[PDB]
Design a protein around this ligand. Structure first.
Ligand SMILES: *[C@@H]1O[C@H](CO)[C@@H](O)[C@H](O)[C@H]1NC(C)=O
Ligand SMILES: *[C@@H]1O[C@H](CO)[C@@H](O)[C@H](O)[C@H]1NC(C)=O
Length: 198
């Protein structure tokens, strides 16, 4: 039975700090078919050749995705500094991963656009003298996710519950929507729970 990538093709992809995670087990995949639907600008594979990626057998296959402007590609690079790795998404390199940046063609209709691209500029607890920043663990959500989900309708809008404080930055989506996918694979327990279609 085939792995169904319909969910990422349907609806509006979330802001980066609230990325969507799809996990596939006990199914076969056709990654070429999924990727061919997008205009790929960048991609980067760690501990994989995309060939090995498109033809290997794993115990599970995880896909994280979110709306993301391609020109912010460097902030997603391994070892990068700044708000994106700090407060939004820090890639987990403990497993073979591939990061793909792509533009959604208008010919692809089921994907809808948000009004704004968005990311967190900070996530902290107030100390006594300054801010005690809280940084993303690899592959995990910001601890400011609950606050961030309150939404941002202006630039540098803040949210707090007393303890935590977050601040988001927003800007209009101009042109075709651009996205990021992080494909991750695991070699556990289950040898060939996930294999390439044939
Ligand atoms: C995977 O999808 C591609 C379309 O991009 C198609 O050409 C190919 O035949 C498919 N592979 C299998 C095994 O179905
Ligand atoms: C959208 O239409 C075709 C069919 O999917 C696609 O291959 C093509 O790249 C797109 N058209 C453009 C980009 O003008």
């Amino acid at each position: 039975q085939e792995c169904d990538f319909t969910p990422m093709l349907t609806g509006t992809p979330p802001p980066i700090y609230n990325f969507k995670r799809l996990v596939f087990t006990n199914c076969n995949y056709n990654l070429t078919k999924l990727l061919s639907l997008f205009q790929v600008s960048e991609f980067s594979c760690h501990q994989v050749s995309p060939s090995s990626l498109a033809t290997g057998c794993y115990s599970s296959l995880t896909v994280d995705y979110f709306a993301y402007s391609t020109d912010m590609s460097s902030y997603l690079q391994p070892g990068s500094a700044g708000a994106i790795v700090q407060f939004n998404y820090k890639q987990d390199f403990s497993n073979p991963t591939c990061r793909v940046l792509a533009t959604v063609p208008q010919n692809l209709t089921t994907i809808t656009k948000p009004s704004n691209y968005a990311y967190l500029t900070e996530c902290y607890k107030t100390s006594a003298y300054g801010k005690n920043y809280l940084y993303n663990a690899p592959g995990a959500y910001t601890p400011c996710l609950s606050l961030a989900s309150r939404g941002f309708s202006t630039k540098y809008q803040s949210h707090s519950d007393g303890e935590l404080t977050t601040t988001g930055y927003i800007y209009p989506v101009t042109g075709n929507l651009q996205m990021a996918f992080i494909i991750s694979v695991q070699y556990g327990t289950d040898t060939n729970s996930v294999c390439p279609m044939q």
